[PDB]
Design an enzyme around this catalytic site. Structure first.
Site, short mmCIF file in Angstrom:
data_model
loop_
_atom_site.label_atom_id
_atom_site.label_comp_id
_atom_site.label_asym_id
_atom_site.label_seq_id
_atom_site.Cartn_x
_atom_site.Cartn_y
_atom_site.Cartn_z
N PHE A 38 57.13 -36.82 8.69
CA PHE A 38 56.15 -37.86 8.38
C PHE A 38 56.80 -39.21 8.02
CG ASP A 150 54.08 -28.87 11.18
OD1 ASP A 150 53.94 -28.44 12.36
OD2 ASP A 150 54.35 -30.07 10.92
CG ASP A 407 72.68 -32.50 35.60
OD1 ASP A 407 72.32 -31.82 36.58
OD2 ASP A 407 73.75 -33.13 35.59
N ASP A 409 73.99 -27.41 34.06
CA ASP A 409 74.45 -26.57 35.17
C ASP A 409 73.79 -26.99 36.49
N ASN A 443 65.77 -41.33 50.66
CA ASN A 443 66.02 -40.37 51.74
C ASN A 443 65.08 -39.16 51.72
CG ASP A 445 67.50 -36.45 49.56
OD1 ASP A 445 67.60 -36.23 50.79
OD2 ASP A 445 68.15 -37.34 48.97
CD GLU A 447 68.13 -32.79 45.18
OE1 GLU A 447 67.96 -31.83 44.39
OE2 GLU A 447 69.16 -32.93 45.88
CD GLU A 452 67.88 -42.19 43.46
OE1 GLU A 452 67.66 -40.96 43.45
OE2 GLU A 452 68.43 -42.75 44.43
#
Length: 463
Positions: A38, A150, A407, A409, A443, A445, A447, A452
């Site tokens: 809080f 909570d 990301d 792996d 392109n 893809d 992905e 991007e």
């Protein structure tokens, strides 16, 4: 989507000791520790003893009180007298006209899942030891008539191991993205008792063992619907290797009718806990996908919210600085800049030392980013332009950190499908993001890489 949740001038890790901010004429502010349930958490030092504390600072103008002042003071006095190795100690409560302050022990460890998913592997025995400690803390607090209400991974700190539960007792008296997974039907239906904590712990257990929440969905509304119905299953591949014993415990913790839900004490003495913690590789990767998807979505939200909020505040500062710029050369000194930020929050309608120090720090960090003239004057349009760039940079860095986790792996890339989950959680419309994905995936893809993904957030703020 973005500008509602954001609309934090202090940054985690920043030292404020130069500002001589003092709380209750006793605690010297040392360092911003982060954003808590809080409000803000600040490392502070008792100026008499040298003892260091974490002080949770809760803004009164933005945060509401559900109970009268006498109830709050009685719970604080109770809370001060409890001690348990798995419960973060509360020392003190105080206030002034701007804030509520809660003084606690200094937080050790990181958030539960963050600490689990930094490691390479995670085992059944680890999960059992974790849950045993959570249940030990809960058992003790219930025995002393204190309910959390909570309970969730964000409130559970792990020091890689020792668990500490934070914010135990707050919620009764004061009114993110991960919230909905953990909350009990009881507290959605307004049923007021201790068993809600056992539901939350059972959800955590389910997630520790499978890496997937039992009541899942692409967004808040879907999740709350599944919680409402209370229907979950053990039909995931993950659960093929999980024993009947562990499953039996989860079943008892996730009983819909609270009167029939197992107590924390009986859960603590459950056969599964006894066998595992007495003197199997789980899917860490599922736990990682789950946790990191939540963090990246939050970071994407904050990046958009900060960008939009900063645009709005820049237009209002521009009006304010225009009025102050009497000779019309566009130049102002440091004290004029500071006065202008204060004017801004007067239009908002607020009258504070911590905020004053936060304002001087933001102003100074912007000035430290510019090759300053030795006359002391600054073109305010340059100041505001650098100010915009500095906040985009900071938000980019938070996006970067959340992406690294996501990301670990991976290809360095995010799928359309993952994008649907992230934006599902952000409440951003499928046609808004798919339209922006077209512009960005050149392109086709299906992905996209990090930069991007970031450009897509920028464009979503422009759409």
């Amino acid at each position: 989507i973005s500008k509602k949740i954001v609309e934090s001038k202090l940054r985690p890790g920043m030292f404020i000791q130069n500002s001589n901010v003092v709380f209750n004429e006793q605690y010297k502010g040392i360092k911003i520790l982060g954003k808590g349930s809080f409000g803000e958490v600040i490392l502070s030092r008792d100026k008499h003893t040298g003892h260091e504390y974490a002080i949770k600072v809760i803004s009164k103008k933005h945060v509401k009180r559900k109970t009268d002042k006498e109830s709050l003071l009685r719970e604080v006095e109770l809370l001060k007298m409890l001690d348990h190795i798995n419960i973060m100690k509360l020392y003190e409560f105080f206030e002034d006209n701007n804030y509520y302050y809660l003084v606690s022990d200094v937080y050790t460890g990181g958030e539960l899942f963050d600490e689990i998913i930094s490691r390479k592997r995670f085992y059944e025995i680890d999960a059992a030891r974790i849950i045993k400690q959570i249940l030990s803390g809960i058992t003790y607090m219930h025995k002393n008539n204190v309910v959390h209400r909570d309970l969730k991974p964000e409130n559970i700190l792990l020091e890689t191991m020792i668990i500490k539960i934070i914010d135990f007792g707050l919620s009764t008296h004061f009114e993110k993205i991960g919230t909905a997974y953990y909350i009990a039907p009881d507290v959605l239906h307004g049923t007021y008792d201790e068993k809600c904590d056992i539901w939350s712990c059972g959800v955590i257990l389910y997630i520790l063992l499978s890496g997937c929440p039992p009541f899942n969905g692409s967004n808040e509304y879907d999740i709350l619907k599944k919680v409402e119905a209370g229907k979950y299953t053990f039909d995931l591949p993950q659960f093929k290797k999980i024993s009947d014993k562990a499953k039996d415990l989860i079943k008892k913790m996730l009983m819909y009718t609270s009167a029939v839900r197992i107590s924390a004490r009986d859960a603590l003495e459950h056969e599964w806990i006894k066998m595992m913690t007495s003197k199997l590789e789980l899917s860490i990767a599922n736990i990682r996908q789950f946790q990191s998807t939540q963090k990246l979505a939050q970071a994407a939200l904050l990046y958009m919210g900060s960008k939009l909020t900063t645009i709005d505040e820049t237009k209002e500062l521009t009006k304010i600085f225009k009025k102050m710029d009497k000779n019309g050369d566009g130049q102002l000194d440091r004290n004029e800049l500071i006065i202008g930020y204060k004017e801004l929050l007067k239009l908002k309608g607020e009258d504070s030392d911590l905020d004053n120090a936060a304002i001087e720090y933001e102003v100074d960090q912007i000035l430290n980013s510019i090759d300053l003239d030795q006359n002391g004057y600054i073109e305010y349009s340059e100041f505001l332009t650098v100010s915009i760039d500095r906040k985009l940079l900071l938000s980019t860095e938070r996006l970067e950190k959340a992406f690294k986790l996501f990301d670990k792996d991976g290809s360095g890339k995010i799928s359309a499908n993952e994008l649907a989950q992230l934006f599902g959680l952000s409440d951003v419309s499928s046609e808004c993001w798919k339209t922006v994905l077209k512009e960005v995936d050149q392109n086709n893809d299906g992905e996209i890489d990090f930069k991007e993904f970031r450009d897509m957030l920028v464009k979503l703020c422009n759409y």
